């Protein structure tokens, strides 16, 4: 029953987000002269995912891409699909599922960052109408942050400093969402869920930065070529390729301090 420390747990937060979004988003109960605006915002939110997916799978030509594209167009054209909270949530959750599986690795960094940027706004209506609109923004940002964390786990940490810098970028976003949900006991259960997820993210991101390749700083007596450095530290000049990404300076003047892996003979 040994514990697992190689992947994140997204099912808990996603279900937690579902409950919070369904609690307040209700276009059929908000005051009638604001339903049109609230629905329009949701249509925009889905469009953001549509643009993201189309960008990632540009060179794909399988038979599944045509079906997915048709599904996106059909839902947006239909006007009644967003009157049901059940339908609204399902489209939002599934849209990200296709987005995440479109590509693996660094390809998703730019796409997800843009969506987070768009979901940093706050509604300017009053009373209930404000809650029905903030729910769309808050729900989208949390989902994007969760999937962005999963993307970071699929790439090798270039350096400890860089790996930890990436983590701080995520903790800040999750912390902001926690404050909003706990501003005036707006959603107590949501606040607890976000707080628990953040510590879980830290347990993995910190481990990746410090222990994925287990980097250490060496102290050479002077600048030397990449090939020579690789042979000395390890014993195989063919491994010089690794040193390219972690050290600045030209290939013939690496040093005098080098960053490399731990020899584990």
């Amino acid at each position: 029953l040994v514990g697992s420390l190689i992947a994140l747990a997204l099912s808990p937060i996603i279900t937690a987000t579902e409950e919070s979004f369904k609690r307040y988003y209700s276009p059929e109960n908000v005051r009638y002269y604001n339903s049109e605006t609230v629905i329009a915002t949701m249509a925009e939110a889905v469009q953001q995912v549509q643009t993201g997916y189309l960008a990632l799978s540009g060179n794909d030509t399988s038979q599944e891409k045509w079906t997915i594209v048709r599904d996106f167009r059909n839902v947006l054209i239909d006007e009644f699909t967003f009157f049901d909270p059940a339908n609204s949530w399902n489209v939002l959750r599934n849209g990200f599922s296709y987005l995440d599986s479109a590509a693996v690795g660094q390809d998703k960094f730019t796409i997800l960052r843009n969506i987070i940027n768009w979901s940093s706004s706050h509604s300017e209506l009053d009373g209930e109408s404000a809650d029905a609109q903030n729910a769309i923004f808050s729900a989208v940002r949390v989902l994007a942050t969760a999937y962005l964390s999963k993307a970071y786990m699929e790439t090798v940490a270039s350096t400890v400093n860089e790996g930890l810098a990436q983590y701080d970028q995520i903790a800040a976003i999750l912390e902001q969402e926690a404050q909003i949900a706990q501003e005036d006991c707006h959603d107590n259960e949501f606040f607890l869920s976000i707080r628990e997820f953040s510590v879980s993210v830290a347990r993995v991101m910190v481990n990746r930065a410090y222990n994925s390749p287990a980097l250490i700083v060496y102290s050479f007596p002077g600048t030397m070529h990449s090939l020579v450095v690789a042979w000395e530290i390890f014993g195989d000049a063919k491994r010089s390729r690794e040193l390219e990404g972690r050290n600045t300076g030209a290939p013939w003047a690496i040093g005098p301090k080098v960053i490399a892996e731990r020899v584990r003979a």
Binding site: Y32, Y33, T110, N117, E124, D126, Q169, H225, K238, P251
Partner: protein
Amino acid sequence: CTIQRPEPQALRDKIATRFSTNVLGGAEIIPESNEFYVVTLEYAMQEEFFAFAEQMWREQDPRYACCENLVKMAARRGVYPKPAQFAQGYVRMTGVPGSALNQNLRFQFENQTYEAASVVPDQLPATGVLVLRVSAVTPGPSGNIRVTEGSLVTPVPGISSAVTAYGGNFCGGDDAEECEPFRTRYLQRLQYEPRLTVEWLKSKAMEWPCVTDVFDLGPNCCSVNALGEVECPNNIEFYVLFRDTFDCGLAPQCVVDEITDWLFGSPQGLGQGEAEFGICGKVRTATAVNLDIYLNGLSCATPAQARVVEQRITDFINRHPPSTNLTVEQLRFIGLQVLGSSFAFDVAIRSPGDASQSGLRFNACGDAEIDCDYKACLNSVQVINNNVTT
């Protein structure tokens, strides 16, 4: 088709075979001989070439260039980082008319100093009231305090030492950008193209301080689009609101005049401002029209429901666009949505004191008709009962 950087082992063999076949006539390369060192040195020079090339071609990619290289090849195309901004707001001062003013006025509200941002008139107006636009002296978010009373930093003859800020609103402060947020919004701007769509102009006006809403001229306004002997439309005008700062969200003409000059430039028609060349426009305010609403029968509903109906009605009228009828049917629907279709609800609109107000007229159906440059402002909502039940 694609040719890529070769791997190490596949690269050395290419050199060794080429060297052996052409120079040594097929002879094998015996290790530790002079030719062995010649071959390996040749390979080293080969690999260092590709490694440097791959490293350098990364810099031209904005998604990975270092910070100091991103600022360049970004100022080349006309994109620069953003420094700390300044907070702004409006103030009001009074005194003896005719007193000489100065262009170096300064205001101290609470541990914060604000300097005049607009051109101060030479002498105080006849009515003895003046409204300016001020901006904080120290940039940053700390300039968004909410205070209503302040004093002039240095006394001036004939002018009181006490000043007030409209609604105590000060907005605009912000901090400088960082490297990562700047990398985005640049490679995001690469995928954008402005088009002067009316939405773009409408969104532009909202960047002015303390502006909340913006609407086109209402149905009861007959616009003019030619302004010259041109074939098809050339002009555009629209309203503005200041809901959170001025009473009823309506500002005096002294302010909207400043907005018009900045947005459309001065002189107009030559693209001196933020608008397209050859396009003229104007931003205008409105005058308040007070109204009173008498809800009938609400007293027999639960107290919780009564407050909700009152709150919703007040909010709706506050957001009403200028120069637009405020029909009775709209108010009645709000009541039905919460009280239920079976409730005995009724509403009516009357003027305060049943007097006559310029720009106001009632139609047969009971609605309120409002002319151009006028807005429906709520004055008081009262509940009356003249029926029996329960």
